[PDB]
């Protein structure tokens, strides 16, 4: 969940995957957390602080 993985095309050597940190909450894909979840979470944050 914390890392977004991909493959690069190979050249001169078999390619090795690469991973980037998602760095934030909102970068989770919409299939795993739809937008309505984000609206509910924001409303909960506001009621929190």
């Amino acid at each position: 969940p914390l890392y977004d993985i991909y493959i690069g095309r190979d050249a001169g050597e078999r390619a090795r995957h690469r991973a980037v940190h998602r760095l934030m909450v909102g970068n989770l894909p919409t299939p795993l957390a739809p937008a309505a979840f984000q609206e509910a979470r924001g409303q909960q944050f506001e009621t929190a602080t």
């Binding site: 190979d10 050597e13 090795r16």
Partner: protein, 292 residues
Amino acid sequence: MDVHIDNQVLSGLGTPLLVHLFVPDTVMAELCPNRVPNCEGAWCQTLFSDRTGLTRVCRVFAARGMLPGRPSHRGTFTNPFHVAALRFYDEGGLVGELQIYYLSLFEGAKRLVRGIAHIFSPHALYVVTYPELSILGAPEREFRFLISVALRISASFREKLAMQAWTAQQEIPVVIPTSYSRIYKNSDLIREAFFTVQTRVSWESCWVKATISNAPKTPDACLWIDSHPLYEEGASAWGKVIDVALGTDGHCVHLATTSDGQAFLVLPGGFVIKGQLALTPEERGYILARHG
């Protein structure tokens, strides 16, 4: 700074004078991309701005550490015109040569640690001074050396094509799609292949390692290959050993050197061209002093 007192007991063995140093991690990122290896193996060398050279002092085996300054990240701890060379490596095969020019080590020891400009790579290098105790030719030699050697190999390939009545055959049984009807412009294959062969230069190319063989028995049965992408789609890899797949995958120009002086140019589609390797005793000796 412990390796510095670790050296000086036996440091006088190899070389009369040395300079203590520290190398940032972003500076090492030139040598060892996609990795952060330790430098316990890392063995130095020395270099002079004339034909004379001495190497293999093996100065410092140094661990990583943060600098004494708090805002110093996490870097790797360790005639005013020459290209001093250093060679880092680990227990594995991850080896990298870095250049240093004087006017950075002499002037860099100014005043007990200070940043200096690195001419070869645009980043700072830190030098620590113990408080109690013909400009362009010097970097231009290796380049023209390797360029002329590769051009000699290219001329051999051209004459071997001339011997075959300007035709080619296969020596690696890979079935082509048989759809080659100037698709990929079968002439452009050899045009771009010669492009990449004559352009690219690296001290660790295939023929470099193939010239210097430990034994007579084993390297006869050993092949040294390097394949690089067509039209610079990526980075090159040098010095793979063969104790075929490379003829299959397209857009990879393959160069295979034997220990005997044979070179082989493999194109996408398994076609093989032969060439000969010839080095005078002087260039052989210079390469033996460098690589060995």
